[model samples]
Target: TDVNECLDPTTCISGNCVNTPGSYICDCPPDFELNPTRVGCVDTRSGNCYLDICSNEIGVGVSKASCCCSLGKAWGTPCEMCPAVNTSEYKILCPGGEGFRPNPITVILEDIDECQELPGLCQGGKCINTFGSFQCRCPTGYYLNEDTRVCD
Candidate 1:
């Protein structure tokens, strides 16, 4: 009988685990490598590492800097978001990859129209589509119920 160590979470801490015959290997994502301790992955890039782990993704349309040092800005300057653009305008530029690699990925960042996505969001109220969000406009004699996200 062969034991698969990848099935166990403790096999690889914060890394991709591969099960071998009575052995296992931890495969780290891009821009990172297994530390000398062999317990976790370490940032191989120079300067202060931003979003050290690949799982720290904030979703699409956002850029994650591998490392930043000589910048005159603060620590938060590394991670950045695309500039706000008009509705249905040109697509935004963001980082796209399987791992947290410091690469520029161009993607069409479509604004999710919550009004259409969640039909019952307004609950009979008018749903207005916004750039990055949505708004509910209640009908006459109706008020927006904030807690339930419905019109009453």
Candidate 2:
């Protein structure tokens, strides 16, 4: 249902939706996360984010809200912005200023990095990042030989 999943603007705002429904189905575009809301994706670099129509019309007319920087912060563009989804920054500690950020600061995990513990893992190949972890990949004809290993 990956392709089917993409059909929904809510499910995947960014990614190459594919595969099935058992696991994460959409694949983000270049420099994007394959599964933005699930496992594997962690520790990433990000830029300023803002709020857009948080939910085009989760409540039509009644509300046309803008996505926030988790705490009322702002961003330049919608894509560059994030939606307020009741997080700790508004999470379990919401309805108050307890978890409120003085300034809107967010780190949207876009890619999963496996350069952890072993930075120089991929040898003679490329250290391509993935959702769960990382992969030591090679050119078209070749493939992932092994970790800190070589290609065939």
Candidate 3:
């Protein structure tokens, strides 16, 4: 029998250890991406990200690494600040130096209507739209469940 290195706790750092024919492999968890070296892990939820500058006017503790601005880019938080819809001086661009825009910017907080965004969101129910949230009205025999949006 070969050595079951996967049984060793230290075999994989911050990853699930998978035993192979002659060795073990490390598997990254959700929100954790394998590092460039493929020997370590980087957490996407709270990892350091450079080059994604954000406007401090949005709020305190707003930055590239703090609020995952780089992760979502133009439509991301902290960078998506706007005083008014299509009239604020706030500006943001996509990743790299792409050709999205290159001038003073105007944007909006932009309400995302979840009722229309997700198809069949309310199963056995109706979806009511709100400013920043939504509600569900289930059928007579059904009751609105948790955040799953399904009526049970």
TM-score of each model, in listed order? 0.32, 0.23, 0.30
Residue 148, candidate 3: Cα error in Å is 3.0
Query: Against the true structure, candidate 2 has what lDDT?
Result: 0.33
Worst 10 residues of 1 by lDDT: 88-97
Q: State the displacement of the C-alpha of residue 71, model 1, in Å, after optimal TM-score superposition.
A: 16
Candidate 1 stretches with Cα past 4 Å from truth are 48-152
State the lDDT of candidate 3 residue by residue for 87-116, as single tens digits. Answer: 212222211121121111121123334454
What's the lDDT for residue 134 in model 2? 62
Best by TM-score: 1
Candidate 1's TM-score reads 0.32
Instruction: Report the lDDT tens digits of candidate 1 across residue range 52-102.
Output: 222222122222222221111111234432222232111111122111222
From the highest lDDT down, the ranking of the candidates is: 1, 3, 2
> So what's the TM-score on candidate 2?
0.23
Candidate 3 TM-score, C-alpha based: 0.30
Compared with the true structure, all predictions reach lDDT values of: 0.42, 0.33, 0.41
